[PDB]
Amino acid sequence: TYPVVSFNKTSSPELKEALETLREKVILPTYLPPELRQKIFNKKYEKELAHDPVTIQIDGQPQRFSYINMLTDMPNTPKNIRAALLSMKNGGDFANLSGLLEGMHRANRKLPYWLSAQIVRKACKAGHLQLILNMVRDVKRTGFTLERHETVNELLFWIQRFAWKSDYSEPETRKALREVQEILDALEGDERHMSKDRKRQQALTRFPYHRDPQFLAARLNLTAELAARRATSEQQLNSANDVKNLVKYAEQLVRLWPADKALLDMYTDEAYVARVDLRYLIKPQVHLRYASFTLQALKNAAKIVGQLGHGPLAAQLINRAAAVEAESQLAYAKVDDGMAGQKIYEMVVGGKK
Amino acid sequence: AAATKVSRKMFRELHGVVVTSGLIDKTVKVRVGGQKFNKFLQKHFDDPKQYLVHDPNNSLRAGDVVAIMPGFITSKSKRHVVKHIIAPAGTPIEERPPIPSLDELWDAKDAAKAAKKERKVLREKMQAAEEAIELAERMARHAVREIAMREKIISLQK
Amino acid sequence: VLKLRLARFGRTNAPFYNIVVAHARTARNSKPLEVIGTYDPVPKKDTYDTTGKLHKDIKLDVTRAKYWIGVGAQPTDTVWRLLSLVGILDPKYKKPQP
Amino acid sequence: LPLIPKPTPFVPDVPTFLTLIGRDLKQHADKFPTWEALFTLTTDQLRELGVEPPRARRYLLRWRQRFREGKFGIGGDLKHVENGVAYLKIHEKEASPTRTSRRVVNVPANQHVEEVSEGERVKVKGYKVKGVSTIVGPYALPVQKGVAKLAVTEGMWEDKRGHKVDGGERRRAEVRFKRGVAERKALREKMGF
Amino acid sequence: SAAELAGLPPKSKQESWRRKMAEARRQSLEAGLQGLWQRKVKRDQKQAKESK
RNA sequence: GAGUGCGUGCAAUAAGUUUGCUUUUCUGUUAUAAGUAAGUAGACAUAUAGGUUUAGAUGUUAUAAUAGGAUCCUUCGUAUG
RNA sequence: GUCCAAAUACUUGACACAUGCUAAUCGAACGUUUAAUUUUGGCUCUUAAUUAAAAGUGGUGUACAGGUGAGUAUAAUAUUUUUUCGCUUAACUUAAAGUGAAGGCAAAUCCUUCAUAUUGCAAAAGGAUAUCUAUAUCCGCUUUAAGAGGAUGAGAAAAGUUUCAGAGAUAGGUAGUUGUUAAGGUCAUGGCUUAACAAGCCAAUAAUUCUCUUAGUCGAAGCUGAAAAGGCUGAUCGACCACAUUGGGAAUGAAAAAAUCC
Ligand SMILES: [K+]
Ligand SMILES: [K+]
Ligand SMILES: [Mg+2]
Ligand SMILES: [Mg+2]
Ligand SMILES: [Mg+2]
Ligand SMILES: [Mg+2]
Ligand SMILES: [Mg+2]
Ligand SMILES: [Mg+2]
Ligand SMILES: [Mg+2]
Ligand SMILES: [Mg+2]
Ligand SMILES: [Mg+2]
Ligand SMILES: [Mg+2]
């Protein structure tokens, strides 16, 4: 079906070593049939393998497989992945994740729940948002499921930042608004993103990921940054069409989001307890991270919706903003000087850069 | 309720003559009279038959006339029993071990059969109690490891 | 699978059916378990009747057929209709009114 | 006695009806001068017109009687058909504050779903929405995100006659082996030598 | 069925069919058995009566 | 002298095949051993972070005993002489 | 030798066979490919899909139906009548309960295993269609209790029946073989099984074994006689047995009951 996983672009020598180890001992054996794979991990066939090593046609020249001590020879997959991931400072360095995560999916390697949230951060802080979105769309091969509530909260954050980067320019904002809709449709329609872990996180929040106020505020942010610019017939039709979504999403978020409830109180009190689900929000450094854009969204949406003559929505949106702004200020007095949280919030809400 | 008593049904009585005796314990060959009808010749022919009759107390000598009854199964080839002696041969009837009545013979089967079930119920219970103690011992070694490992965690949370 | 079905007997252009109780996977005209009744497809006409009506002669043992139906016997389409007319079962097909 | 059913938008004329049931029945389209001749002609009259073999005739009488009862095939309900083509669109709703009920409706190609009334917004039976924007259903070619169309294809409603794959179960081996001897000849004799 | 002894209506179209068919097999067995039993009794009496 | 769709003895023998003082091998429980590969648990800390660290309760790997099933050989065994 | 209807129609070489046909079916079990159609990403190449055809993987059925009479010489764990019983996880009826979790193949209702299933052994599989401004059905799957059916257990006991080809030779056959004691097994009975003793059991007119010749068996089924427990045949009809070029074999399955398979 798909081409054999391969890594042929490495800037550093440590990167290649980490991948070649995982590739030739954890990924390559998965391309073998079931029978021949129960031989490499046996001692009774060690002597036979040395005489006739197994071969597999991998892009021409066949491969070779000798005895592999399951306990000793096998490498630590989590550690290596971390080493390989940390040593990535190039476009081609991050292009190997599609193959790396694909190999682990073939080996049935239960990866850390938080790994998906980490790969999104490091890969997005270098300018490779597409590589992550390409894997999220190609979830049948890479296995980049949107299981964790954090991963979706980390993905939408960078999506907005890339649009907020260039002062919410219409060309990128239009493209960025498509990425959010691409995800909200995947979480809802696609089934590959649904797992037992996600069911537990939805039962604790009582909101499905596609109807979660925290994630629905990102779509209302870009939608509010489009009507602002305009509120040339072809472009005038888009503006009038963006005002309908704004009023629609503005009236859809107010219903879900209760009255005067901040981020740390929106969900049930039993969601923040467990560390495997929705505990990152507790820390002040991480709350301001996902509370900056969502806060500015309400402020920017309450204004425009107020110019069109919608009293109720104005007060409603301001209600949430007032409750979120207060909580945000609280965490701003505890975040240690130098943390990314304090910086991001200061540059977005503080308008200082 | 758990014991199956014998049928204890009476059957026809046949008068025969002991042919052989003393060759095997509690068994004699008696010769009875019969008749078979030839359909082609429309004529009855004498069809005498010889069976192996069960002699419980070995009270029959070759030559005497006896009365036998069928339906009493004691062996593979034996389905007849001695009801009484018509005419003795050699010695009087009063000089031979008495012939047990059919009731006495049947009672032996029931008593022997009932005793057999008593042995089974004991063997089944003992075998079950002997296997439930080995299955309860696995729980012991398995329950201590769990409690020894589960309480370790419980103590690191207070 | 006990089945209430028709065994075709007669000559060319003279069909005469015989209601039987036989196992599904058996020859059509093999000796069945029971012969409930007989069926004549060609409709007859009363001897001294000039009106023009027609009828079909069917000799059926209702009592015996009922027992077999109660133990899981599966009558065929043709026999099911006949039983419906007598009122033992509900019609398997009905004319559309619209 | 032989009541005639009014033509349906998806089946305006006879050529369409005969084209949907396939089985190469569009050869006798000219035999029927009007739409009432199809539903008025009898077996004997279909035998003289030239409707043969008997399998095609009995098959037509069946679909005929099946049309009077409104047991239409795929696309029968459709009301907004245009020159043999219809368009499907997704009609979103709100069953709850966190769910959404999507239904495959049939509306004019130009109009929008939200620009139609309840009476003019039919729900095509047999077509379901899988995911947030995919219309899934037999003979549903996609045009845009959330838009599909049904072209009137020959054999739309036909009941395919089972065809033996390769000579059948009894003769499968012979046909394959006998065809394997005709291949090794071209490879060796006609081409090799 | 338990749902039929509690006075509950049929769940759907098919349930109505099964209820009717199963009931047709219930009255067909009762009449069949009782009907055939009378035949036997009526037959045995004739033999005994005519044999005595 | 010629033939033989016949019986039978011996030798031989494909498929198949009784038995185990056979030849490998998988699985199942039972008891141990390991915690490095995996997987499942708990403890501590970090922050554009997600690291350190111990543990076997399910399960994973290793050995032992034991049960069963495939293989190899053995015996019987068409053709054939 | 004018016509019509019905019913019969290789009785011989089970000799050799050209050609087309006699068992397939389900897309509401499952994905694979190929085409178009619509989309992503990068600037034709490349993702994610829909649809339609073509080959398959699966489930069920080819254990029914139809054909032939080569081989086959029988009394046998064969058969009735009454009494008493046993087994049956597939299909057919009625009802109840349960339908969760992983791995392997491209995927699966295919394979492998796990949790739970009155105590403890011992299960399963998912697919499809509607309603609302998640819920309820549909077709299945597993287990359990019964009815029916069954090709079922050596069923058992009592009393009976079964016209068994023709010719020739053979006086021994039987070794758990016959019986007793004890125990197990069984619904029950039976060397059914085992231990220990005893030397029995069947038969003498052929029990038993052997060779030759011939044959599918049977029925008011066909023909025939006034009739005989009539005679002959063993076509079409029904039942039973055997076989599918000849010979030698096993598995699958509820059950070989195949024109299968080796
Ligand atoms: K030999
Ligand atoms: K023959
Ligand atoms: Mg040899
Ligand atoms: Mg380790
Ligand atoms: Mg030989
Ligand atoms: Mg012939
Ligand atoms: Mg057959
Ligand atoms: Mg399930
Ligand atoms: Mg009598
Ligand atoms: Mg014996
Ligand atoms: Mg012959
Ligand atoms: Mg014959």
Distance of CA A205 to the CA centre of its chain: 19
Selection from A5, A29, A190, A193 nearest residue A101 by Cα: A5
Could you tell me if A243 and A323 are in contact, meaning their C-beta atoms sit under 8 angstroms apart?
Answer: no
C88/E24 touch (CB, cutoff 8 Å), yes or no:
yes
Q: Tell how strand B80-87 and strand B49-54 pair up.
A: parallel
Check whether residue A210 has its CB closer than 7 Å to nucleic acid strand F.
no
Touch test E–B: 3 Cβ pairs or more under 8 Å: no
8-state DSSP, A294: H
Taking the C-alpha atoms of residue C19 and residue C22, their distance in angstroms, rounded to an integer, is 10
Q: Which amino acid is located at A235 in the chain? A: Q
Question: Ligand 9 centroid vs B26 CA: distance in angstroms?
Answer: 29
Q: Tell how strand B43-46 and strand C2-11 pair up.
A: unpaired
Give the torsion through C-alpha atoms of A69, A72, A77, A80, to 10 deg: -120
Q: Which amino acid is located at A1 in the chain? A: T
Q: Which amino acid is located at B34 in the chain? A: G
Taking the C-alpha atoms of residue A202 and residue A180, their distance in angstroms, rounded to an integer, is 19
**H/E segment holding residue A215:** helix A213-227
Nearest nucleotide over every DNA/RNA strand to the C72 CA, judged by C1': G93
Chain D residues in contact with C98 (beta carbon < 8 A)? 69-70
B14: β partners: B68
Taking the C-alpha atoms of residue A197 and residue A210, their distance in angstroms, rounded to an integer, is 16
Alpha carbon distance, N-terminus to C-terminus of chain B = 60
Check whether residue A118 has its CB closer than 7 Å to nucleic acid strand F.
yes
Taking the C-alpha atoms of residue C95 and residue D69, their distance in angstroms, rounded to an integer, is 10
A227: β partners: none
Q: Which two structure tokens, joined as six digits, stand for E52?
A: 């005595």
Selection from A268, A152, A146 nearest residue A195 by Cα: A146
DSSP annotation string for D11-67: B-SHHHHHHHS-TT-GGGTTT--SHHHHHH--HHHHHHHT--SHHHHHHHHHHHHHH
DSSP annotation string for A60-85: SSB--B----TTTTS--HHHHHHHHH
Selection from D85, D76, D100, D193 nearest residue D149 by Cα: D85
Give CA separation, A245 vs A209, A221, A251, in Å: 19, 11, 10
Beta-carbon-side half-sphere exposure of residue B62 (alpha carbons within 13 Å): 9
E31/C90 touch (CB, cutoff 8 Å), yes or no:
no
Beta-carbon-side half-sphere exposure of residue A79 (alpha carbons within 13 Å): 5
Distance of CA A311 to the CA centre of its chain: 36
| CA dihedral (D57, D59, D62, D66) positive or negative | negative
Q: Which two structure tokens, joined as six digits, stand for A181?
A: 């809709």
Report the alpha-carbon angle A334-A336-A339, nearest 5: 125
Cα-flanking dihedrals φ and ψ of residue D140, to 5°?
-125, 90
Chain D residues in contact with A189 (beta carbon < 8 A)? 130-134
Which of A181, A187, A210, A254 should be substituted to probe chain D, the one whose Cβ sees the most D Cβ atoms within 10 Å? A210
Tokens 């007060």, located at residue: A315
Selection from A135, A137, A161, A313 nearest residue A222 by Cα: A161
Experimental method reported for this structure: cryo-EM
Taking the C-alpha atoms of residue A49 and residue B90, their distance in angstroms, rounded to an integer, is 93
Chain C residues in contact with D68 (beta carbon < 8 A)? 96
Cα-flanking dihedrals φ and ψ of residue D105, to 5°?
-110, 170
Q: Which two structure tokens, joined as six digits, stand for B43?
A: 């004529």
Nearest nucleotide over every DNA/RNA strand to the B27 CA, judged by C1': G179
| D68: closest chain C residue by CA | C98
Which bound ligand lies closest to the C-alpha atom of A74?
A: 4
Q: Which two structure tokens, joined as six digits, stand for D64?
A: 């005929």
Helix (H, G, I), strand (E, B) or coil at A219: helix
D151: β partners: D85
Give the torsion through C-alpha atoms of A105, A111, A116, A122, to 10 deg: -100
Taking the C-alpha atoms of residue C68 and residue C74, their distance in angstroms, rounded to an integer, is 9
Q: Mark out the alpha helices in chain E (DSSP H runs).
A: 2-5, 13-51
8-state DSSP, D8: B
C66/E32 touch (CB, cutoff 8 Å), yes or no:
yes
Nearest nucleotide over every DNA/RNA strand to the A157 CA, judged by C1': F48
E28/C64 touch (CB, cutoff 8 Å), yes or no:
no
Question: Ligand 6 centroid vs E12 CA: distance in angstroms?
Answer: 61
| CA dihedral (C74, C80, C83, C87) positive or negative | positive
Which of C66, C79, C83, C89 should be substituted to probe chain E, the one whose Cβ sees the most E Cβ atoms within 10 Å? C66
Tokens 């391309």, located at residue: A31
Q: Which two structure tokens, joined as six digits, stand for B158?
A: 């207070």
Report the alpha-carbon angle A222-A224-A230, nearest 5: 110
Could you tell me if A103 and A22 are in contact, meaning their C-beta atoms sit under 8 angstroms apart?
Answer: yes
Please, which residues have CB within 8 angstroms of residue D171's CB and are 6 or more apart in sequence?
Answer: none
8-state DSSP, A4: P
Cα-flanking dihedrals φ and ψ of residue A300, to 5°?
-75, -25
DSSP annotation string for chain B: -------------EEEEEEEEEEETTEEEEEE--EEEETTTTEEEE--EEEEEE-TT----TT-EEEEEE----SSS--EEEEEEEE-SSS-GGGSPPPPPHHHHHHHHHHHHHHHHHHHHHHHHHHHHHHHHHHHHHHHHHHHHHHHHHHHHHHT--
Reduced to 3 DSSP states, what percent helix, strand and coil does chain C have, rounded to the nearest 5? 20, 30, 50
- Resolution in Å equals 3.1
SS3 string, D51-119, reads CCCHHHHHHHHHHHHHHHCCCCCCCCCCCCCECCEEEEEEECCCCCCCCCCCEEEECCCCCCHHHCCCC
Give the torsion through C-alpha atoms of B131, B135, B140, B143, to 10 deg: -160
Check whether residue B155 has its CB closer than 7 Å to nucleic acid strand F.
no
Tokens 């954050």, located at residue: A157
Edge-to-edge strand list for the sheet holding C2-11: C2-11, C14-23, C34-39, C58-59
SS3 string, D144-168, reads ECCEEEEECCCCCCCCCCCCCCCCH
Please, which residues have CB within 8 angstroms of residue E19's CB and are 6 or more apart in sequence?
Answer: E1, E4, E10
Could you tell me if D147 and D89 are in contact, meaning their C-beta atoms sit under 8 angstroms apart?
Answer: yes
Chain E residues in contact with C69 (beta carbon < 8 A)? 24-25, 28-29, 32
Cα-flanking dihedrals φ and ψ of residue A215, to 5°?
-80, -30
Q: Tell how strand C14-23 and strand C2-11 pair up.
A: antiparallel
Q: Which two structure tokens, joined as six digits, stand for A162?
A: 């890339």
CB burial of residue B58 (10 Å; 0-12, 13-18, 19+):
middle
Chain C residues in contact with E20 (beta carbon < 8 A)? 90
* Minimal C-alpha gap between C69 and chain E (Å): 6
* Pairs across C and D, CB distance < 8 A: 4
